[PDB]
Write a protein that binds this ligand. Structure first.
Ligand SMILES: CCCCCCCCCCCCCC(=O)O
Ligand SMILES: CCCCCCCCCCCCCC(=O)O
Ligand SMILES: CCCCCCCCCCCCCC(=O)O
Ligand SMILES: CCCCCCCCCCCCCC(=O)O
Ligand SMILES: CCCCCCCCCCCCCC(=O)O
Ligand SMILES: CCCCCCCCCCCCCC(=O)O
Ligand SMILES: CCCCCCCCCCCCCC(=O)O
Length: 582
């Protein structure tokens, strides 16, 4: 293209252009104020219009990287506020952008973004809508500089819909606060999801990612031929390889290239991609990534023919092992959309281990004739774990299901900090509530996606403040073995109970005048410390202590004098539980 800036403006549209340029500036210049960035965005946008007007205008033939880096290098405070990052301007084009990207600070030390009160938010939404959402877009971008810029925009667009709807509702807080929470969880999950994919790419290599890709693409596109899924695995692998490097423009191009190829070959890939492929270039690749699984062919035979009983199984394996294993993973995944990707990866790993051992034996065909039986216990293990917990979720609420996990996982790794234990257990129970509402066919893929988010957060929190070697092993093993490693955690018998601290089990009147969440988290914090103090306590004893606690908190703010009931009745509750335990 003659003018790269002109085309992107022509296709993104002015609004998408300014917002993406705002995000881009924020992720590079994370310390500059909002007003400074708006000025750069407007200047870049005004210049972009000259290129749309005449692509031959001055500097309109420069590349986006060149033009973007020039504007960064015009910042007056570059050396004062970012220091070493101002040395990037002494370099040009390839080396300059790579220098700037290297100086992206993934975790800057900016203050916590406080969510204002609803009435303040709705008033700022109406008095200045553009400035309201745009500043927040700037605040999030600068705090997540590797967050893919379109997805960051895509979430921001949904925030406007939440405010428009709820700011005119009867109970605005009842409408808005849940939606802001879903989006905030949706975004933090997505952020952790791509950074996790990149770490796994560089920690376990391209081969392991290509295995994961065959499984995920074959489930999604089960009518697609193996040669087709294979080609899409290689392209998607280069896309993620480049996007993990971190340059927005090359990532956007690689994603748009693949999203274009898939859309021009829908007849050979999937039926579900028409609506996605009619969306603008900005949304194409994101839409395709969220497309639902296509229906698999009706009468597909079992895999026993080509992979177990047929002669040449070892011959076809040894001529090109990753081709053969890829064919096995493709055939298995496309028939089992109800399996998690890591489950199918466990299956291919077992199939690979069997062929390697058996093809070296005297009678290989006899050695691997029973290989399909080795898959069953691997398949049943998550399926049974889903039913135990979803049945447990049906019996209890989401809250009381969280309380069960609270007790369960405190006994397994009691060394984990109480805030991490409360947060991760609350999140795990929420994985239950969401995924246990899906029929059997959709339960395990649900759990894998949302367990990967919760467990990674657990492993992120644990990496920075190590406290348990077993959790470290689960966090450093293959992602395929992550969840089964955590599910293999047994109760820590070497733990010595934590010493009783009366102030930890002392409650004041603040508990009854608290938000439903802080009230739950404070009750759940006291539950963790209760288990940490009497770990060998049975469920009848604990249920008895939680039952007396329910009446204790129910009555002390059901009385005329609330403040001192909590200390006097708390002295009654704690001493009785002390005797009822140990
Ligand atoms: C990542 C997309 C934009 C994120 C900014 C949220 C939308 C701005 C309106 C203010 C909402 C408060 C944000 C929050 O507390 O979750
Ligand atoms: C006949 C066309 C050749 C296509 C080759 C595709 C190879 C797929 C790579 C993924 C192999 C996964 C094997 C594994 O690690 O378990
Ligand atoms: C740095 C140049 C300023 C404008 C930013 C270019 C737009 C980035 C996203 C382009 C659309 C990518 C769509 C996709 O993910 O496939
Ligand atoms: C982080 C999303 C990667 C962007 C490239 C995806 C291009 C469309 C292929 C989507 C097929 C499913 C692969 C996936 O799970 O992301
Ligand atoms: C507290 C957990 C609630 C949801 C129950 C899910 C337990 C089974 C997860 C195993 C399937 C995840 C993917 C896998 O490991 O194959
Ligand atoms: C750090 C406390 C341990 C964290 C617990 C991680 C377990 C993830 C859910 C595993 C599936 C639910 C049932 C199980 O543990 O077998
Ligand atoms: C050893 C001192 C005993 C006090 C320990 C109190 C433990 C609080 C359990 C949390 C209450 C669960 C019931 C609920 O939140 O509805």
């Amino acid at each position: 293209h003659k003018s790269e800036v002109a085309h992107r403006f022509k296709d993104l549209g002015e609004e998408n252009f300014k917002a993406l340029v705002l995000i881009a500036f924020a992720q590079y210049l994370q310390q500059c104020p909002f007003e400074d960035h708006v000025k750069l965005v407007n200047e870049v946008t005004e210049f972009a219009k000259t290129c749309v007007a005449d692509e031959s205008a001055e500097n309109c033939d420069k590349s986006l990287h060149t033009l973007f880096g020039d504007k960064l290098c015009t910042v007056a405070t570059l050396r004062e506020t970012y220091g070493e990052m101002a040395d990037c301007c002494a370099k040009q084009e390839p080396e300059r952008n790579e220098c700037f990207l290297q100086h992206k600070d993934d975790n800057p030390n900016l203050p916590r973004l406080v969510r204002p009160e609803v009435d303040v938010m709705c008033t700022a939404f109406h008095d200045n809508e553009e400035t309201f959402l745009k500043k927040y877009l700037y605040e999030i971008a600068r705090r997540h500089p590797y967050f893919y810029a379109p997805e960051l925009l895509f979430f921001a667009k949904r925030y406007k819909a939440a405010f428009t709807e709820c700011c005119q509702a009867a109970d605005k807080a009842a409408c808005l606060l849940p939606k802001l929470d879903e989006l905030r969880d949706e975004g933090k999950a997505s952020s952790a999801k791509q950074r996790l994919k990149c770490a796994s790419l560089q920690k376990f290599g391209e081969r392991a990612f290509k295995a994961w890709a065959v499984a995920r693409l074959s489930q999604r596109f089960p009518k697609a031929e193996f040669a087709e899924v294979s080609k899409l695995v290689t392209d998607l692998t280069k896309v993620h390889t480049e996007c993990c490097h971190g340059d927005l423009l090359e990532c956007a191009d690689d994603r748009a290239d693949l999203a274009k190829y898939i859309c021009e070959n829908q007849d050979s890939i999937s039926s579900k991609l028409k609506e996605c492929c009619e969306k603008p270039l900005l949304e194409k690749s994101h839409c395709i990534a969220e497309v639902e699984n296509d229906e698999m062919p009706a009468d597909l035979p079992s895999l026993a023919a080509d992979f177990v009983e047929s002669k040449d199984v070892c011959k076809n394996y040894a001529e090109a092992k990753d081709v053969f294993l890829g064919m096995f993973l493709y055939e298995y995944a496309r028939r089992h959309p109800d399996y998690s990707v890591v489950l199918l990866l466990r299956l291919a790993k077992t199939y690979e281990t069997t062929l390697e051992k058996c093809c070296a034996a005297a009678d290989p065909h006899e050695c691997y004739a029973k290989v399909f039986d080795e898959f069953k216990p691997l398949v049943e293990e998550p399926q049974n774990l889903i039913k135990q917990n979803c049945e447990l979720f049906e019996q209890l609420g989401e809250y009381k299901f969280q309380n069960a996990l609270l007790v369960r996982y405190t006994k397994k790794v009691p060394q984990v900090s109480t805030p991490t234990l409360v947060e991760v257990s609350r999140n795990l129970g929420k994985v239950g509530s969401k995924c246990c509402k899906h029929p059997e066919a959709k339960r395990m893929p649900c759990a894998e996606d949302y367990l990967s988010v919760v467990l990674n957060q657990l492993c992120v929190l644990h990496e920075k403040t190590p406290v348990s070697d077993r959790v470290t092993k689960c966090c450093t093993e293959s992602l395929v073995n992550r969840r089964p490693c955590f599910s293999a955690l047994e109760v820590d018998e070497t733990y010595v109970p934590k010493e009783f601290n009366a102030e930890t089990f002392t409650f004041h009147a603040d508990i009854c005048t608290l938000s439903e969440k802080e009230r739950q988290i404070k009750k759940q914090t006291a539950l963790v410390e209760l288990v940490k103090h009497k770990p060998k306590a049975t469920k009848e004893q604990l249920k008895a202590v939680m039952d007396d606690f329910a009446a204790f908190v129910e009555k002390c703010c059901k009385a005329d004098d609330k403040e001192t009931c909590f200390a006097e009745e708390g002295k009654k509750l704690v001493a009785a539980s002390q005797a009822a335990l140990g």
